[PDB]
Structure formats: structure tokens, C-alpha cells
């Protein structure tokens, strides 16, 4: 119940919660983590994802389709050096 204020929504990126970055770090062997780390991990996730999704959306359109299948993602990764077994 507001005036100009409508109904706001957070950034889909803020969805990656600080607790989840910490859990990914501890599996990497880290011990004490800083506070300026979280706003840094988010950017590097975003860049990776942007290069992969771009290739998948390309591989799709060429098939005249409009759905990104698993096989489109597996090829993008292989073009980038990372190979995923199991789909």
C-alpha cells in the first residue's frame, strides 16, 4: 500500500547468497575468508556464464529451434576447454 512505490524485486544475482560462496570456498580448501570477496565472486560467475550461454543460443538458432538443449551447452564448454562427461 504505497504511492509511487509499486512492488520492487531484488537482483537475480543477489540470489547467490554469501553462505553459498563460503561453502564453495571451503570445498576448495580456503580457511578464513574476507568481506570484499563476495562482491568479487559474483562478477567472475557472471562473465563465465555470459560466454557459455552466448554459444549455446547460437548453436540453437542454427537448428531453427528456440530451445537450448543439453547438447548445445556441452559443445560450448568443449569450445572453451572444459569437457563435461555425463551431460
Amino acid at each position: 500500500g504505497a504511492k509511487r512505490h509499486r512492488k520492487v524485486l531484488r537482483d537475480n544475482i543477489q540470489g547467490i547468497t554469501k553462505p553459498a560462496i563460503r561453502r564453495l570456498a571451503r570445498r576448495g580448501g580456503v580457511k578464513r575468508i574476507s568481506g570484499l570477496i563476495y562482491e568479487e565472486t559474483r562478477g567472475v560467475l557472471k562473465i563465465f556464464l555470459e560466454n557459455v550461454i552466448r554459444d549455446a543460443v547460437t548453436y540453437t538458432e542454427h537448428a531453427r529451434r528456440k530451445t537450448v538443449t543439453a547438447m548445445d551447452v556441452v559443445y560450448a564448454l568443449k569450445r572453451q576447454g572444459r569437457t563435461l562427461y555425463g551431460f
Binding site: 537475480n12 580456503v30 578464513r32 567472475v44 530451445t67 537450448v68 551447452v73
Partner: protein
């Protein structure tokens, strides 16, 4: 306990498990948002987002191990942003 002993507890359990972190719904929102830019009006199967999530987690874990090495090189235990900026510069990532 004394700060640091429950932390070494966590670097053991998670290195032994193979269950995925990151809630499934938030990642799927993020990917879609990142996608409305390259091509407007596009749908995603479920398996695709699954694969994407698996890969991302691996990337981040690797980055996190090399950013720990870099920090130790400077005689610290806290990993700071400069270590993320040094590691990526040596690996070529944009």
C-alpha cells in the same frame, strides 16, 4: 569451541561429499536473465540448466584453490580480492 576448528571440520566434510551447493531455483533465474540479452524469446530445457550449474561450481572451486595458493604465497591465511585479480591474470580469463 575456539574459532578455526569448526572451519577445518567444513573443509573436510564438503571435500568428501558430491552433493551440489547453490539452490536450483536462483541459478535458473540468473541464467534466464543473462539470456534475455543475447536473444529475446528463448526457452531452456531442464537438463541444460543442470549442466550449466555443474560446470560453474567446478570453475569456482578451481579458482578458489588457486586464490588460496596465491594468498599463502604472501604469508597470509585470509584470501582477499587481490588474490582473485592475480589468479585470473595468470590464467588468461577476461
Amino acid at each position: 569451541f575456539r574459532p578455526g576448528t569448526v572451519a577445518l571440520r567444513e573443509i573436510r566434510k564438503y571435500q568428501k561429499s558430491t552433493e551440489l551447493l547453490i539452490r536450483k531455483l536462483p541459478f535458473q533465474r540468473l541464467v534466464r536473465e543473462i539470456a534475455q540479452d543475447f536473444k529475446t524469446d528463448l526457452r531452456f530445457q531442464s537438463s541444460a540448466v543442470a549442466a550449466l550449474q555443474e560446470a560453474a561450481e567446478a570453475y569456482l572451486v578451481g579458482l578458489f584453490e588457486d586464490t588460496n595458493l596465491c594468498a599463502i604465497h604472501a604469508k597470509r591465511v585470509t584470501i582477499m580480492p587481490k588474490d582473485i585479480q592475480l589468479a585470473r591474470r595468470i590464467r588468461g580469463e577476461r
